[PDB]
Design an enzyme around this catalytic site. Structure first.
Site, PDB file in Angstrom:
ATOM      1  N   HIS A 137      51.487  35.521  40.742  1.00 20.65           N
ATOM      2  CA  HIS A 137      50.152  35.433  40.151  1.00 20.65           C
ATOM      3  C   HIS A 137      50.277  35.504  38.617  1.00 20.65           C
ATOM      4  O   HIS A 137      49.795  36.472  38.013  1.00 20.65           O
ATOM      5  CB  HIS A 137      49.225  36.558  40.708  1.00 20.65           C
ATOM      6  CG  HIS A 137      47.773  36.365  40.395  1.00 20.65           C
ATOM      7  ND1 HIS A 137      46.769  36.652  41.321  1.00 20.65           N
ATOM      8  CD2 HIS A 137      47.138  35.915  39.271  1.00 20.65           C
ATOM      9  CE1 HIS A 137      45.570  36.374  40.773  1.00 20.65           C
ATOM     10  NE2 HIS A 137      45.770  35.937  39.509  1.00 20.65           N
ATOM     11  N   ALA A 170      41.220  32.616  32.415  1.00 18.10           N
ATOM     12  CA  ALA A 170      40.534  33.078  33.630  1.00 18.10           C
ATOM     13  C   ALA A 170      41.338  32.765  34.897  1.00 18.10           C
ATOM     14  O   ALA A 170      41.193  33.482  35.898  1.00 18.10           O
ATOM     15  CB  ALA A 170      39.155  32.446  33.718  1.00 18.10           C
ATOM     16  N   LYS A 220      45.850  26.328  42.927  1.00 17.02           N
ATOM     17  CA  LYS A 220      45.073  27.549  42.837  1.00 17.02           C
ATOM     18  C   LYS A 220      43.605  27.161  42.970  1.00 17.02           C
ATOM     19  O   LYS A 220      43.133  26.308  42.192  1.00 17.02           O
ATOM     20  CB  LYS A 220      45.252  28.204  41.462  1.00 17.02           C
ATOM     21  CG  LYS A 220      44.207  29.304  41.193  1.00 17.02           C
ATOM     22  CD  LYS A 220      44.516  30.590  42.011  1.00 17.02           C
ATOM     23  CE  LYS A 220      43.630  31.781  41.659  1.00 17.02           C
ATOM     24  NZ  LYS A 220      43.895  32.332  40.334  1.00 17.02           N
ATOM     25  N   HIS A 222      40.024  28.630  42.385  1.00 14.93           N
ATOM     26  CA  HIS A 222      39.429  29.748  41.674  1.00 14.93           C
ATOM     27  C   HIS A 222      37.922  29.530  41.586  1.00 14.93           C
ATOM     28  O   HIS A 222      37.465  28.461  41.166  1.00 14.93           O
ATOM     29  CB  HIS A 222      39.973  29.876  40.223  1.00 14.93           C
ATOM     30  CG  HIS A 222      39.792  31.226  39.595  1.00 14.93           C
ATOM     31  ND1 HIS A 222      38.560  31.656  39.086  1.00 14.93           N
ATOM     32  CD2 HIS A 222      40.682  32.239  39.348  1.00 14.93           C
ATOM     33  CE1 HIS A 222      38.711  32.874  38.546  1.00 14.93           C
ATOM     34  NE2 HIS A 222      39.994  33.261  38.731  1.00 14.93           N
ATOM     35  N   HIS A 249      41.331  32.605  44.929  1.00 14.57           N
ATOM     36  CA  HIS A 249      40.389  33.594  44.422  1.00 14.57           C
ATOM     37  C   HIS A 249      38.990  33.083  44.805  1.00 14.57           C
ATOM     38  O   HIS A 249      38.510  32.066  44.284  1.00 14.57           O
ATOM     39  CB  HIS A 249      40.600  33.710  42.888  1.00 14.57           C
ATOM     40  CG  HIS A 249      39.523  34.446  42.135  1.00 14.57           C
ATOM     41  ND1 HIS A 249      39.806  35.322  41.077  1.00 14.57           N
ATOM     42  CD2 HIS A 249      38.162  34.410  42.248  1.00 14.57           C
ATOM     43  CE1 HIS A 249      38.684  35.807  40.581  1.00 14.57           C
ATOM     44  NE2 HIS A 249      37.641  35.250  41.281  1.00 14.57           N
ATOM     45  N   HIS A 275      44.924  38.956  44.994  1.00 17.38           N
ATOM     46  CA  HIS A 275      44.190  40.209  44.786  1.00 17.38           C
ATOM     47  C   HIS A 275      43.184  40.452  45.919  1.00 17.38           C
ATOM     48  O   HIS A 275      41.961  40.423  45.718  1.00 17.38           O
ATOM     49  CB  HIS A 275      43.438  40.291  43.435  1.00 17.38           C
ATOM     50  CG  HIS A 275      42.797  39.030  42.950  1.00 17.38           C
ATOM     51  ND1 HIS A 275      41.780  38.368  43.673  1.00 17.38           N
ATOM     52  CD2 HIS A 275      43.036  38.297  41.818  1.00 17.38           C
ATOM     53  CE1 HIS A 275      41.412  37.265  42.996  1.00 17.38           C
ATOM     54  NE2 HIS A 275      42.184  37.202  41.822  1.00 17.38           N
ATOM     55  N   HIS A 323      30.931  41.381  30.906  1.00 19.25           N
ATOM     56  CA  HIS A 323      29.526  41.270  30.508  1.00 19.25           C
ATOM     57  C   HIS A 323      29.388  40.835  29.039  1.00 19.25           C
ATOM     58  O   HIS A 323      28.452  40.107  28.680  1.00 19.25           O
ATOM     59  CB  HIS A 323      28.734  42.563  30.824  1.00 19.25           C
ATOM     60  CG  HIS A 323      27.387  42.645  30.159  1.00 19.25           C
ATOM     61  ND1 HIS A 323      27.203  43.146  28.860  1.00 19.25           N
ATOM     62  CD2 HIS A 323      26.155  42.283  30.581  1.00 19.25           C
ATOM     63  CE1 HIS A 323      25.926  43.086  28.525  1.00 19.25           C
ATOM     64  NE2 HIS A 323      25.265  42.575  29.578  1.00 19.25           N
ATOM     65  N   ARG A 332      31.365  45.483  42.887  1.00 21.26           N
ATOM     66  CA  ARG A 332      32.548  44.762  42.413  1.00 21.26           C
ATOM     67  C   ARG A 332      33.792  45.669  42.396  1.00 21.26           C
ATOM     68  O   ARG A 332      34.871  45.320  42.901  1.00 21.26           O
ATOM     69  CB  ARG A 332      32.232  44.223  41.007  1.00 21.26           C
ATOM     70  CG  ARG A 332      30.967  43.370  40.925  1.00 21.26           C
ATOM     71  CD  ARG A 332      31.148  42.162  41.832  1.00 21.26           C
ATOM     72  NE  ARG A 332      30.277  41.023  41.571  1.00 21.26           N
ATOM     73  CZ  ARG A 332      29.200  40.690  42.285  1.00 21.26           C
ATOM     74  NH1 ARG A 332      28.807  41.435  43.314  1.00 21.26           N
ATOM     75  NH2 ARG A 332      28.515  39.608  41.944  1.00 21.26           N
ATOM     76  N   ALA A 359      45.443  38.227  32.606  1.00 24.56           N
ATOM     77  CA  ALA A 359      44.062  37.849  32.941  1.00 24.56           C
ATOM     78  C   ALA A 359      43.310  39.041  33.536  1.00 24.56           C
ATOM     79  O   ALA A 359      42.185  39.307  33.125  1.00 24.56           O
ATOM     80  CB  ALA A 359      43.954  36.618  33.798  1.00 24.56           C
TER      81      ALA A 359
HETATM   82 NI    NI Z   1      41.618  35.947  40.351  1.00 24.90          NI
HETATM   83 NI    NI Z   2      44.432  35.703  37.985  1.00 32.39          NI
HETATM   84  O   LIG Z   3      42.857  36.860  38.890  1.00 36.83           O
END
Ligand code: NI
Ligand code: NI
Ligand SMILES: [O]
Ligand code: NI
Ligand code: NI
Ligand SMILES: [O]
Lengths: 563, 122, 100, 563, 100, 100
Positions: A137, A170, A220, A222, A249, A275, A323, A332, A359
């Site tokens: 990752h 990101a 990936k 995302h 993700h 994750h 934010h 979260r 990230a």
């Molecule tokens: Ni992610």
């Molecule tokens: Ni990542």
């Molecule tokens: O991530």
């Protein structure tokens, strides 16, 4: 003549039945067997054994069974075992694990592990030797991240990015044929193995597939590019045809679907779930249920690892920051799922670690946090049932697998890297037990040292201060090409992309990653029903409640680090 | 309870080296005026010419000491050492060029030893 | 100044030692790198003072004691080595077991 | 019109009969002659001489006798003389030493030293210019060692190693075809000339010879690989056939033989004897007797150089450390031989210096210690008999030879490097007299500056602080290839190894080193009977006792160094 | 912080000057690099204080005297130059013969 | 010492903070990089002391006030972030609007 065990271990490293503490944790590994012949151990220096006509053969040319490099007396910690052996390397690969020396005069010498004129010696007595860590990752955001990864024993970076562009900041994505080409060329200069992921997003096949053909090693998906049912489906169709891995993700917002919708789009196909706990991203609040499915290869990123008193505050910190980047941040960050994630690691339900480098994760702390997690679980749960001899060997193998063999398997590169086995590339990390998992002693890439903790370059000897991590000759000039692998899709290799771009690095083929699942995760192969209560975030495994608490202090922390 | 980072907890007992091989004790004198150290794995008959001992008893053998250690002889010093048998193929090449083949070739080894003045041949 | 590579690197050791000494002055038990930095910089400043290699080999065993450092740190440090310019040129100081 | 001498020297540098102090030592060098025509000196800047139609020729294209680079007004210190001249360089070689400028209008201009449109100028008035230092005892252990060597005026590294592997940490050896290939490729990235030694160990020819064929430039016999009669004999047979040098570190333990046995194995063949004094290794206690033989080319390594009050303590230190690496260390470190080594240098009996970089010697102190030694001998013995005019020119030439021409001759590379002579490669070091032998001003590699003591890169001019050593444009991009030489055996060059590995550096041929001896060592050509008393370690030269004492302080030390 | 290359390099000069000032405070005669570091850092801190180039050109001749430094050091240092950010932007200060 | 890349880099922050604190002690209003260095080093030394992330988030708002810094500097600094090794491992501290 006999040597007591204490003196034996301080000259040759430990032998069967001896135990070694991992750094400053309470984890003990025990030597399970030893390939040596007692009294014929190999060693190097004045009046020692590896000398011409003695432990060094004076007859044979390099092709005649002679090694390019012998690591003597290594204590190997690997999914395949914790044991004592010499490790022989040739043409940049591990060719022999056994007993090295000279069959002229020594018993028990593995036939292809002759020390000859062509052989270099690394003394590994008193060291632990592991495979290089495989970080799947990685965000390629700042080239300074490579030495950070090497210093903590990582040798392969899989991920994406073009530097500090918001997309790359990101997502682990190098988007499109041209960005992929540019980064393959950049890779020529990075002293670590690399594989690059394209953008797993699109509603037609061709915009996606063309990235595989350009040289991407995987994709990936995302949420920030749209983790919709369409992009999931198209990416997995591409991956099934190209034999590469997809990482996901998922849609944290649950905008186009809930977790069950994402599983339906996946439709039983193989996928690496990044994750999986969800602080790092994914269906709120229940993403972690992914880790129970037989088609899911589940990894953790490292900032939730393991659960500590500062964990939540710093993640709340991290959410404020999101934010302030104004990212749809008024659920979260959940103590229930982070706590549970500790236990799922210990149970073999989450199979892999990874960083999330730059990230939401730390490039140099995958290996470090793996052991902190194992140590916390021993302290809280006690020895696993499977242990005996009072050692932690079973837990040590389950944990070492999370950052070595299992990422390699999931990515389709375990034929090259991910474990100390014969036939694999010689990516090896030497550790002093006192620094184990904290600061690597020497990092070997393709049979040459690439990175080392070493002292004053002007001194009479290399040990005077200051001792710090430094790039070694494996990283200099053209040797950087021969000691490192760019992993690429079969179609890009078949289409001649390396020659078309001028790549000089060893080219690794990604393969056999569509025909695997959870059962293929070494020591970490548990499938189960994970329930996450929508109202309370309470985690259940096969109807049983999972509960843990954070710790105030960790080993492998303030004893070691200057900041 | 005190933690020594990376410490060993070695199992109980002892390691026997060169187990199951014949051992032999001989007397050896450094007749030279400078010190001589001898390593664990040099074919014993091929050591420095000025060491006086029964050279025949050095054939096919080496010091019975832990791998990588050395016996020390001061100028004029005479002392006993224990020998063990070479293993593997029981061949020696190079070093002093006395053997260059099977250690079974005792007469050939001693003839070369004597001609070159390695002390203690018949 | 004409700094050569070692002169530039060794500024770092002095800096780490200053940092560690501030930490010790506010009451912290010192860690592995802090302890190494302190004893190393002591050696290099000693050589600058014109002490002998023999003096610094003795004195280096008494710069920090076990109560100054975290548990396990004495046993992690088996030796500390530093090269510096003595009045008679560069020499190597090794301090064996500096903290008991 | 006349200029008094004081003003003359401060504008153009000194002229015949003037003397210059070397750094802060009591050594004085005197200008022996001057190639200039007084009043036609060359110089560069506003309203100066090297301007179009004046001292710069405006007519001739680069091929017409025009230089690529003129060093103006250099004070050359070389085995060939100490004298004033302009130095002209073209195609990366020294083409002219004489008087540069424009034959249109100036008298006495050396015909091939025209300053034309194609000419760059380096002002060397007020500087001393020497050949680059040739270090023939290098362990390749940490790439940071290269800048250390450049900063003290070294331009060629001969030695061996694969980085901080125990073999390389003990011995100057790159073992076997594959390690040699890898390090030749690494060499592509190192901004200094390099030659690599293979392992001089084996009882058959082929395992050794195959290293020469793979690209090694020589061999190293080291006790830690078995410095036996067989390995000595086989290596010298290989070297006599391949025309490369063998370096020896003999059997300190006297295990297979005493010094007379090693000489018998050598059998009158040429050999370079490393660290001949023996603290660095070799037959205890009498190795230093090697330096009396006509077939031996004897070097010192630098930590014993010269003999000082801390020398023994630090070497005793170094022996403790070896015991702690547990290297058969319960004779070795002898004040009698170290003292004598001072005098042997002064007498021309030890011909060469070298570092022993990072194994038992200091990469950046070969040149530094050479002058400290010369200075100590003048202080203790007084001017040599051969001196006159009150100068130290004779001693300065004997000492400068030890680290420039003599290593080059011994290695078989003096046709390329090792002295400021016409036809040789333009490896040149500029020194301010105040820093002479301590910190080089500018290091020229193949006609381009590679390294320089220079200031703030953001400033209006290059002299503001901080002034430190920095790599210059000669080291950047592809220019690193053109400014540096990889030295290789004739057979590897004939077999096309450079093309087979993709080497882009200039390839130098090693040759003419089997047909030399002690007599070929410039200014250092003494053969004699050296006796070392076995009981007292007392040193005699032709029956006369050699005795010296250590000094408390050296020049070229605390006045200069920040640590 | 947004450090640019010069800002990072120049931290070294301040550091060397701190090291040198500790050495002077314990009674050592200063060497060539120590002396250069002290006078250079004095100039850069002076410019940070808002002094003029003219002031620092004068003051720089009186920061160290011959009795503060080793024999020969005054004559080794012909000039010391430093660029720093004055209230009116970067300017160059050269101090000629700073130590007599 | 076994310094890793971050440990080497972060020595610079401590150094810049020492420089800035000397400047503040002689009466200067601090600039943008000086202010950042001071607050950042405060955070890292805080974590070394064993404070919590929550404590350093509060305390970081009170290390420098507007009267300690030049005009506009409070508004230039929206956040200061630092990672350091707490007793429980590396954590991230963000201090929002540290100077009002
Ligand atoms: Ni992610
Ligand atoms: Ni990542
Ligand atoms: O991530
Ligand atoms: Ni040697
Ligand atoms: Ni050496
Ligand atoms: O050596």
């Amino acid at each position: 003549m006999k040597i007591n065990r204490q003196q034996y271990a301080e000259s040759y490293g430990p032998t069967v039945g001896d135990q070694v503490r991992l750094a400053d944790t309470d984890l003990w590994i025990e030597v399970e067997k030893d390939y040596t012949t007692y009294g014929d151990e190999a060693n190097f220096g004045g009046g020692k054994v590896l000398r011409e006509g003695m432990g060094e053969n004076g007859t044979y040319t390099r092709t005649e069974n002679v090694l390019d490099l012998l690591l003597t007396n290594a204590l190997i910690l690997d999914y395949t075992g914790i044991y004592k052996a010499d490790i022989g390397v040739k043409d940049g690969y591990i060719v022999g694990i056994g007993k090295g020396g000279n069959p002229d005069i020594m018993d028990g010498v593995t036939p292809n592990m002759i020390v000859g004129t062509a052989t270099e010696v690394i003394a590994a007595e008193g060291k632990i030797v592991t495979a290089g860590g495989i970080d799947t990752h990685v965000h390629f955001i700042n080239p300074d991240q490579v030495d950070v990864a090497l210093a903590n024993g990582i040798t392969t970076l899989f991920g994406g990015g073009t530097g500090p562009a918001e997309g790359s900041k990101a997502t682990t994505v190098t988007p499109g044929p041209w960005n992929i080409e540019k980064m393959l060329k950049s890779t020529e200069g990075l002293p670590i193995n690399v594989g690059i992921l394209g953008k797993g997003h699109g509603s037609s096949i061709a915009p996606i597939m063309e990235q595989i053909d350009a040289g991407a090693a995987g994709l990936k998906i995302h949420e920030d590019w749209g983790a919709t049912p369409a992009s999931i489906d198209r990416s997995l169709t591409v991956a099934d045809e190209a034999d590469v891995q997809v990482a996901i993700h998922s849609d944290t917002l649950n905008e186009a679907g809930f977790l069950e919708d994402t599983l339906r789009a996946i439709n039983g196909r193989v996928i690496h779930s990044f994750h999986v706990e969800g602080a790092g991203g994914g269906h709120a609040p229940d993403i972690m249920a992914m880790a129970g499915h037989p088609n899911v290869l589940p990894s953790s990123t490292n900032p939730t690892r393991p659960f500590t008193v500062n964990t939540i505050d710093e993640h709340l910190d991290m959410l404020m920051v999101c934010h302030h980047l104004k990212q749809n941040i008024p659920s979260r960050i959940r103590p229930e799922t982070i706590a549970a994630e500790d236990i799922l690691h210990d149970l073999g339900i989450i199979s892999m670690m990874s960083t999330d480098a730059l990230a939401m994760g730390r490039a140099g702390e995958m290996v470090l946090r793996t052991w902190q997690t194992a140590d916390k679980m021993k302290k809280q749960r006690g020895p696993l049932a499977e242990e005996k001899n009072g050692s932690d060997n079973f837990r040590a193998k389950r944990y070492v697998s999370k950052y070595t063999i299992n990422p390699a398997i999931a990515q389709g590169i375990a034929h090259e890297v991910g474990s100390i086995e014969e036939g694999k590339f010689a990516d090896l990390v030497l550790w002093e037990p006192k620094f184990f998992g904290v600061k690597a002693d020497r990092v070997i890439k393709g049979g040459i040292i690439a990175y080392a903790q070493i002292g004053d370059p002007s001194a009479s000897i290399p040990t005077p201060q200051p001792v710090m991590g430094r790039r070694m000759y494996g990283t200099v000039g053209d040797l950087i090409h021969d000691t490192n692998i760019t992993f690429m899709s079969k179609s890009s290799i078949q289409q001649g992309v390396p020659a078309k771009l001028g790549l000089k690095r060893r080219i690794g083929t990604v393969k056999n990653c569509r025909n695997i699942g959870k059962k293929d995760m070494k020591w970490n192969d548990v499938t189960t029903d994970i329930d996450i209560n929508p109202e309370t975030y309470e985690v259940k495994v096969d109807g049983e409640v999972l509960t843990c608490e954070p710790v105030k202090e960790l080993p492998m922390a303030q004893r070691y680090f200057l900041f | 309870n005190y933690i020594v980072p990376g410490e060993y907890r070695v199992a109980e007992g002892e390691i026997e080296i060169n187990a199951g091989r014949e051992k032999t004790t001989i007397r050896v004198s450094n007749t030279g005026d400078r010190p001589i150290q001898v390593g664990s794995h040099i074919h014993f008959v091929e050591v420095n010419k000025e060491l006086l001992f029964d050279r025949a008893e050095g054939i096919g053998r080496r010091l019975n000491i832990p791998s990588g250690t050395a016996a020390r002889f001061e100028p004029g010093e005479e002392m006993e050492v224990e020998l063990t048998e070479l293993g593997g193929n029981r061949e020696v090449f190079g070093i002093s060029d006395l053997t260059n083949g099977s250690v079974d070739n005792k007469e050939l080894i001693l003839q070369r030893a004597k001609e070159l003045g390695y002390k203690g041949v018949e | 100044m004409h700094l050569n590579p070692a002169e530039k690197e060794k500024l770092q050791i002095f800096l780490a030692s200053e940092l560690a000494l501030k930490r010790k002055a506010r009451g912290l038990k010192l860690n592995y790198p802090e302890a190494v930095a302190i004893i190393t910089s002591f050696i290099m400043e000693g050589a600058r003072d014109g002490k002998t290699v023999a003096m610094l080999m003795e004195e280096g065993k008494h710069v920090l004691t076990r109560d100054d450092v975290m548990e396990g740190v004495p046993e992690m440090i088996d030796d500390i080595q530093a090269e510096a310019t003595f009045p008679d040129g560069t020499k190597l100081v090794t301090v064996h077991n500096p903290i008991s």
